[PDB]
Assembly symmetry: C8
Homo-oligomer: 239 residues x 8
């Protein structure tokens, strides 16, 4: 039928894996870090480590780990233009890994237009449909932002809201249908809310550290997370 | 005639069966819990047990109950993406039931667009029409939440409010015609008011317990109900 | 001609009968209760006995009485969905009458859409045109309410007001032309005013009793009415 | 020429006849009561005797009166649905007249839509044209009340205000052309102002008596009139 | 050419005559009373003698007088419906003149619609074009008033202003081209200002008398006029 | 080329002639009075002598004057309907001139619609083109006043303001091309500002005398002018 | 290519010359006075010498001077109509030059319509394209002003702003492409800002003198300029 | 695939070269000055050295520099019309460079309309595509300023804001694809924000020196930079 059974679904869910953040405490919040068949969001301040984490994950997501997770090829659609292979080859070190590999290991794609963006989304599917199980993370940073551009003033939001969810929906059907992990950043019942299943909010704790809280995500803990950042990606904050 | 006689109608109502909430003092508010041939609603806070209640009944309605109610299949349409089979196999225990069974006792289907959500409903009918007396519940959680989305800013409500009831009615016709019990959750003269024949508002009384009140329903008691939430779904709150 | 004479009309009016309410004092207000060739309205509070009275009348209207009134077959178009044959078979007792009969005696019809509603109205005529004098009461509860739904925001009332009176008028032509009694409930120079020839307003007098006053109806008495309600329909309040 | 001479016109006016109000001090305000070839209006409160006055004249205008006025047939168009023949046979007595007669002396016709109301008027002319000197009065109560209805909210008045006078003129042309006396009741530079040549405002002076004043009419007296209301219609108020 | 010379025009102006008002002092204001090739206006209070004067002039304008003025046939287009041949035959007495003549002497025309009105205006020309020098006064009372009717709310004045001046202009071309006297009444740089060449304003001076001032008219005197009114038209107020 | 040389232009300007105002101290403000090839305007109060000035010049411009100005025909376009030849024959005296002459020295033409007003102007050109050097003045009083009229409420100015200059330019082209002196009166960056090259504002200094000031014109003196008004038109104010 | 090199451009710029103002100090501000391949603007007060300077420049621009500038034929498109050959033949004296020459030396063109204006602009090019190096100054006074006319109220600025810059741009392509000097006057990031490369503002310093400051122009000095005006154009203010 | 690999991408970035600002403490803010494959912006006051900086770099980017940067051709698109080659030959000195060379090292092109400005950009690409590695910079000053112009009042921004990014993207694609360094100046979530990857805000610290800060850019230092402006372009500010 147009839909399956409960057992049959619980059959699928046995594939829900988590890509780590390198910040154990942080991972604890997401009960293991980034999740699959789910879009994770990055709420941040003008200067936030999200664009930093993205790189991290560009690699945590290549290192087999927790709950028998393999690791794999990733897709980094960049709108902002903050992608830094250099930052990558730098992280692959904290995890002692071949550089050319880590890079050979990610798939880069710069977004320019609110149309170009989905031009890519609808493509990503294709590369996911060809061969699956190779690609474990579809990281788009940032999604909105480029949409806050090709709008037609505070008067044509009617096209923005409509157009946005036109793919932000198509983005869900990728996540749970092809089974992957979609990390997304931005700065906003807001359409891009029920859309993203897990919403992480970020605040700075004085340069070194940062505090990641949950705005809204199934089984959301009231407690906060204390993670640190370095050249080697995101990591736990020590004494 | 395009309508029946009061007697003939009473004929149909002898089939009106209640599906336990799991919390006796809750079932009393509904005089037996969730009722058939009627859209019931879930009025809850940011963090409400409805999401849990929804699974619970994915079970309760399999356990023969009062009124000589056999127990049957179920159709769960998830908009919010919070259906956790893993939670079901967890409750069947408190009811000493086969795990694989219960999970075969449920039909899952994720809703993505305010159009997909109906694309489904217009199909839920068919499966129901194809064969009857098998499916005893059609639970849609949550129903509105997806419509708040696809809308065209607060300027095209005229399309959403019209589209909304365009299906909400379709829901009713199913409910009473095919005779089931449709449970629906949300957080909102409102079109989705006359829509759902019974409406339950839920408030949390300090973590462990919950207070489910009746917003507006036939023969509505002033008194409130006190139920608790546990892995084994919902149940009464003892000393 | 397109219209008759005065005598000739006074000829017709000799058929204006009243269906009782079981509440003598109440009946006194309506100078005999519900009238014919006239639409009666029910102004009420959130919790009003109108939906209660409706059932009562489902039977008072089958019991020959006052001013040589026979009694007969009724039509209960329900929008809200509060129809309870059970409440009927319960009232038929206060009047010592065959149950299966009372039920066999009413014609049920659930309204779903503002269109469905009139789909029914324009039908009712047909069943009235076929054979008359059998049907003495066309009870619609509630009329508006379902219309306050398929509207297009506070901006398209232009279709509501227009559509409403498009049939609320057609509802008059049924009442006086086919000679019957149309009881209607709702909660609002309002179009549905001159439309309904008799308007009764209802207030509660502490659980047991209720006070029915007149908002506007030919020969309207300033005094109030004190009626009580029980399983056996509406009745006079005793000491 | 498309208009006559002053002399020739004076020719027609020798026919201008007054139809008693029943209350001499009222007739004086109208110098003989209701006047021919002129639309007169009824300005009353929530509970006003106009409704009664309307019947009264259904009689008065059958009783030969001053100015050698014979007395004639009548056309009563009821929008408000308050025409009670039973009330007529009641007054003919105070005038010692055959009951069946009076009631054969009146032509009844209920108005339902703001369109039906004219559908009629455009026919009232015909019956008048067919044969003349027979019908001495065309009473329409009330006229506006039905137009307030079919309108499209306060946003389409432009259609009602235009439609309104589209007939109100038709009324005038009848009045003066066919020579009758058209009486009309209501509760409102107003289009229905220049429309009705005479306007009477009525106020109740403690139940029994009533004060009918002149809002605006040719040769209008400051003094007021004091008439009483009784089963025998309207009449003077004695000591 | 499309226009003449000055001498040639001064040739025409030797025909500018004045129809009296019977109120010498008043006539002094208008330097002889009503003028020709000029539209005179009547500014008044709710109860003003304008509709009274009109009748007067219906006759002053038949009595040869001042500046070798003959007298003649008149046209009284009435919108309001206050025309009273009876009042005429009454004035013809103050001037000792055959009654049937005075009447035989005026041409009556009732205006009903803002269209009907000009239907008449454009006709009047025709009767003026056929034979001239017979008709010395075209009296329209009141002009506006009927226009304040067929408007489409305070929103379609765009048709009123435009339509009004569409003929109020055509009214000028009658006045100066056919050489006559156009007296007009109403109650309002207002379009109907530059339009009417002479504007008289009226105020009451305690029942009997009235004070006529000039709002704006070539060579307008600051002083006021004191005229009286009786059955015999307007006349000078004595000691 | 579609424009001439400065020398060639100076050629034309040697013809620029002034037409006396009649009041020497007024002529000085205009350095000789009304000037050729330039639209001059009349800024006056409710009661201003412009209307008089207009006639005056209908003469002055026939009386050979300074600058060896011969004197010529004239075209008077009256919107306001205040042209009184009788006034002209009155002034020619103060200038000892043939009456019949002066009045043959003027061309009259009444303007009715804002369209007629131009219908004319577009003809004034022709008569001018047909033969030249004959007409030395084109006086239009008043020009705006007629446009305030035909407009569509303050909501269609966009048509009037556009239509306005659509002719006002046509006026200019005449002025300078055909070389005349166009005088225009009114009571209003304003389109009719750059329009008229010279603008004169007039104020009355206690009946007898008048103060004409310059609102805005080439080489404008601060000092004011004091002229008097008399039957003999305008002239200086002696001791 | 569609554009040249830097050297190649610096090749052209060796033709940038300045037409003097006769006011050395003023010329110092513009580093030599009016510049070429650049539109200069005149910001002024109600009574400003701009229309005075224009004439001056009509001649300074014919007198070989500074930085080996020849002198030449000019184009004076006048909208306002303040052109005075007389003022010219007067200035040619301060510079001891043949009169008929100075005049024979300028090309006059009066602007009437916002369309006529550009009709001319697009023409000027043509006369510049035929033969160049003869015409050194295209003086338009004033540009805007006539545009503030053919607008369609404060609502159609959408055509004004658009239309204005449609040629004000075409005006740049004349200036730098054909190498000339365009002086423009008016009284207003305003479109006509970046448009005009040099903006001079003018204030009066008590009749005789005037102070010219810079609103915005490359290398704009904070200091002010003190120039005087006489019949002989603009000149330096002495002791 | 329509996008490359992270490794392959790192391949391209090894080419990212910085082009000196001339002020070492300025270059540090940009870690080497203006950066390749990125739109940098100039945030300045009314009087800012950007205009100068723009020329400077017309040189700097010809002088072999750090990162073994050779030095190349340049494309200068001037909207503001302030490009002064004369200024270039002036700086090459401080860098001991051939004058004719430098000026052959630059490609000039003036932008007139918001359409011309792109007409160009869409060509800048071609020349770039035709042959590569030759042009090392595409400087457009200023970019927005021309768009503020052609717009349709604040009511058609919807066209400008859309048109704006319609090219601003085109700019980006060039930048990173053809690998250059595009510098752009202006005075304004803003579409031209995500547009330019780096943004520099400039403030003047008392004539001689200037403070260039970073509004928002990757790895942005809090500290500010202090550079001076001189004929020799921009450079450091010594004791």
């Amino acid at each position: 039928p147009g839909f399956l059974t409960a057992f049959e679904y619980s059959e699928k869910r046995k594939m829900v894996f988590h890509i780590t953040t390198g910040s154990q405490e942080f991972d604890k919040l997401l009960g293991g870090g980034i999740e699959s068949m789910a879009i994770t969001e990055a709420f941040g301040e003008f200067r936030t480590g999200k664009t930093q984490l993205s790189h991290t994950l560009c690699v945590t997501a290549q290192l087999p780990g927790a709950g028998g997770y393999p690791g794999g090829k990733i897709i980094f659609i960049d709108t902002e233009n903050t992608f830094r292979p250099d930052r990558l080859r730098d992280i692959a070190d904290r995890f002692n890994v071949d550089h050319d590999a880590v890079l050979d290991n990610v798939l880069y794609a710069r977004a320019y237009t609110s149309e170009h963006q989905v031009e890519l989304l609808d493509y990503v599917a294709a590369k996911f449909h060809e061969e699956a199980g190779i690609f474990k993370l579809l990281i788009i940073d940032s999604i909105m932002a480029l949409f806050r551009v090709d709008f037609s003033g505070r008067g044509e939001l009617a096209e923005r809201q409509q157009k946005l969810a036109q793919m932000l929906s198509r983005l869900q059907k990728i996540s749970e249908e092809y089974n992957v992990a979609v990390f997304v950043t931005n700065q906003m019942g807001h359409i891009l809310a029920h859309a993203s299943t897990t919403r992480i909010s970020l605040r700075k704790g004085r340069g070194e550290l940062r505090i990641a809280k949950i705005y809204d995500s199934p089984e959301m803990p009231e407690n906060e997370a204390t993670f640190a950042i370095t050249a080697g990606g995101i990591g736990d904050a020590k004494e």
